[PDB]
Every structure is written in structure tokens, then in C-alpha cells.
Copies of this chain bind each other. A is one copy, B any other.
């Protein structure tokens, strides 16, 4: 895969299937400072990607009415967007 989304979706999918399998057989290690941080930087980036494309969509959607450089710049500046992001939206 490539996109950050796909990879995080993939990695998490394997960690879940990896748990079930350990559940089938007590093999839950404590997180390491690096491990945790690594998981946080990834998840953030994946969720960031979802945030990116939703944002572009909405913006592109709400700026459509503008027809002038002034109007376009005016509309964008006044834009405030509420965005929902989920690990299950990858």
C-alpha cells in the first residue's frame, strides 16, 4: 500500500486479528516510549489524511459560488469547518 490511511488501516487490522488470535490461545506487552510515540504519529497522520480530503471537499464545495478573486478570498477567510474523523473511516 501507500497512502498513510491504507497502511494504518492495514496495521490496525493486523493488530486486532493478532489479538483475537492471542485471545484464542495472555500475550499483551507494555508499550515502549518509542512504540507508543510511533503509534501516535501514524494514527495522527492517517486521521490527518481523512481530515485533509474532507476539508478540501467542503472548501471546494463552499467556494463554488465565488466568481471573483475578491469573492473567493473573502469567502475562504470567513470559512470555519467542523470536521469529524474516525479510525474506521480509513
Contacts and interface: CB of A to CB of B under 8 A. Distances in A.
Given A40-B60, A43-B59, A51-B48, A80 B86 contact: yes
Number of copies: 2
A83 B44 CA distance: 13
Instruction: Please indicate which of the listed interface residues A12, A25, A70 has the most CB atoms of chain B within 10 Å of its own CB.
Output: A70
Interface string A4-22: 0000000010011011001
A3 interface: no
A56 to B, nearest CB: 4
A82 interface: yes
A77 B88 contact: yes
A73 B83 CA distance: 23
Contact of A48 (B16, B44, B52): B52
B22 A67 contact: yes
Interface in A13-42: 15-16, 18-19, 22, 25, 28-31, 35-36, 39-41
